[PDB]
Symmetry: C3
Subunit: 273 residues, 3 copies
């Protein structure tokens, strides 16, 4: 009769439900055992003013200007003048060596991503014994946060431990298109990291040869796009979602139990007749 | 008796169901209030022929060739010849300054990603007063779309507003590995953006010194990988999925109501006895 | 009476359930028809020792050292000495031309991402007829896997087909911050690909002019961040999840059928009275 067909259908449905809940529980198990982080992108009209920690050493900051889409031709390269930016100077011991102190010049970065706001910095280093002409730069977010920070020393070391340190060369103009990545760790601590795309442009010096010994450093800092990349694992960042998933698994188990009970009742009814 | 146990179990299950539906509704609320975009990757056998908007200014395009994995040694650098590409020339006023017109040379980009198709371009600029030797380049997709565009002026300005503008230096060969990102905005408008990885190679000039005043620009355009990155928020891009989520929440609320009704019936049955 | 209201409510609920299951089936259809890959990030304490396939040609590897955060000043540039790395030399025919054999020098890469382990390599090429001074480098993962590979020839060709080949220039120090992307293809084959961020630093040669004809190549290999990017489509990589989705759709269809049956029973009860 159709009774055995209904019993088989309900048994198959119970098997389906228990398989589904077991698969969900399993996938939750690999999600917990293998911590994997999801990636998303957030669009924002205006970026928070970042901090650029430059390490000139003996190089002198000739100029620092804010421009929009265009850097006008230099009136006289190698000549200081027209410093229009908020800069700070900090001394902190290196978190790794603990013997050498790194004197950092913090510069407020560009803010208007949609208008391609450019921070153009000009350095001049007359003489050095270093084999390679470079200036180190470390990108951190929220220059105001550093300025408002109490110690201003441990913050710089914590930013040093972050993976946002690069170097730009002398004798070249370095167009840096930086992008922001915010990671929510397992501990919940926010990690701020920077990607960059670099355009290196050769600089042709028309100055008299007598002054050509000095090295000129040009760097242009710019936001690549109004897209902040957020990296976080959904299972760990949201305990409420984990509880919701467990609750849904429990509900699925209960629906499977209800289907099994209906199957048992139908089997009893069939056996009675 | 077991009646009170069953009543407690059903009450707990109703609490679980209402908590689950409330959590889903809440998470939907933060998804709407905080527009966050998901990221996916699409593999395609052959890329659409892109457009490269070069801005030489006074520089003369000596050569433009399509190669496969290998650029043969130059027969004679600094000498024009063997132009084998589809190029266009467009004049459009700059969307920002509105005083300076940007004359752009559009070049069809590489197509075969799986064979590492290379577009090699050679420019020669004999003399200029600019301090920095650079040529600007803007990457947009579907060069055919520009060619088929009616105005060819507003399209160039719209591409200018996009964040895919870089500069390559003279005296160097610039291997550009470009990658395509397609974003579906809140308005639904498609935004085409380009990432790049740049390899700068110094160029050693063995030409006679008398001709060394001229600047040589070499650029190689190549697709990095057959992976187009699509950025879109699932909640907004799919209104059908939003309606489905709301419908599922309503179904969960109804199942909670059914569980509560079963609990009430069991309580009434227990009270009767 | 309220009977018609209940019948309408149940009919609407059945419509909701069938709409939800139809939407799920549809979205599954576009997921299958349009293969789209999800992106995730995995944090690991220590990276697997990668392989760097250098192609010096006639260039002589002067030096290869492992450093931590700092490269000490060079005692004497252009002078060989202090080779401390595990290197291998392999000859394999190019997978594309099949006429030219590419002699590759495989170097073990950095391992400690959290301490910024640096692999610093120094080459010296006294004379060449090539117009552009460059050395090609191909990044693959698990240098041990290559070392343990039986053929060591087909593996190099397979890595050549991968999109992780770049070039670093002579007369410059190239800080390479490499990042690892692992893709699970439709066939299930693992594809290992590398992104990089390049910092090019000009090298000032204080050596006597008589030896300045020789070209010096400096490269620094470093891991950008302890974040491996995994690209895989969930629907295809997990057949169990696909079966679970189909089973859930079947359960939704059955719940819709149950709601319709309850509606029919209520309608019959209303018609009886
Ligand atoms: C540079 O410009 C800023 C903003 O316009 C201004 O606050 C600052 O005083 C200027 N610097 C000098 C030296 O005038
Ligand atoms: C940092 O140290 C240098 C070296 O003594 C000194 O010249 C400079 O004034 C110091 N700056 C600060 C802010 O402490
Ligand atoms: C940090 O500095 C202290 C003294 O200033 C030193 O004893 C310690 O070894 C340093 N930590 C290192 C080098 O890891
Ligand atoms: C050259 O640079 C050094 C570095 O600070 C500086 O002390 C010196 O005054 C500079 N000389 C000239 C002429 O600019
Ligand atoms: C360059 O090559 C293309 C394709 O092979 C061809 O269409 C074009 O006519 C060539 N140009 C010249 C000047 O022969
Ligand atoms: C663009 O303007 C320049 C400057 O007058 C002119 O030489 C060139 O022919 C123009 N090209 C087009 C396509 O209008
Ligand atoms: C655009 O150009 C018009 C005239 O061509 C000018 O009046 C307007 O100010 C410009 N828009 C700007 C500069 O934002
Ligand atoms: C040098 O370049 C300019 C720029 O167009 C060109 O007009 C001139 O003919 C070139 N001269 C030679 C000798 O190539
Ligand atoms: C270089 O250093 C490594 C590790 O310290 C060592 O195994 C190797 O023998 C050294 N090379 C020489 C030539 O001493
Ligand atoms: C590779 O080929 C070159 C050219 O004949 C030879 O000098 C070298 O020893 C070969 N190396 C290996 C490992 O076969
Ligand atoms: C591979 O090499 C063989 C001979 O070694 C040759 O016949 C074949 O054409 C090559 N494959 C190419 C060039 O795609
Ligand atoms: C110059 O480099 C070549 C390339 O191998 C080498 O054979 C030669 O010995 C080198 N000469 C000197 C003086 O280093």
């Amino acid at each position: 009769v159709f009774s055995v067909l209904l019993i088989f259908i309900y048994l198959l449905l119970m098997a389906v439900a228990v398989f589904l809940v077991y698969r969900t529980i399993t996938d939750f198990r690999e999600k917990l055992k293998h911590p994997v982080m999801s990636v998303s992108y957030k669009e924002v009209d205006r970026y928070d003013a970042p901090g650029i920690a430059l390490y000139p050493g003996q190089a002198q900051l000739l100029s620092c200007k804010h421009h929009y889409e265009v850097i006008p031709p230099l009136t006289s390269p190698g000549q200081p003048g027209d410093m229009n930016c908020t800069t700070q100077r900090i001394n902190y011991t290196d978190p790794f060596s603990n013997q050498t102190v790194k004197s950092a010049l913090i510069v407020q970065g560009p803010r208007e991503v949609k208008k391609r706001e450019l921070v153009f910095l000009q350095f001049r280093l007359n003489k050095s014994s270093e084999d390679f002409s470079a200036i180190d730069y470390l990108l951190f977010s929220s220059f105001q946060e550093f300025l408002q920070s109490p110690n201003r020393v441990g913050f710089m070391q914590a930013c040093e431990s972050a993976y946002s340190s690069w170097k730009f060369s002398g004798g070249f103009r370095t167009w840096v298109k930086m992008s922001l990545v915010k990671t929510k760790e397992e501990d919940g601590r926010e990690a701020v990291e920077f990607r960059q795309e670099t355009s290196v442009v050769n600089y042709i010096d028309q100055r008299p040869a007598a002054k050509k010994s000095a090295q000129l450093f040009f760097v242009v800092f710019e936001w690549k796009d109004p897209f902040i990349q957020k990296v976080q694992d959904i299972v760990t960042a949201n305990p409420w979602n984990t509880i919701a998933l467990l609750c849904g698994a429990f509900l699925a188990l209960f629906k499977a139990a209800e289907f099994a009970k209906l199957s048992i009742k139908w089997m009893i009814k069939i056996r009675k007749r």
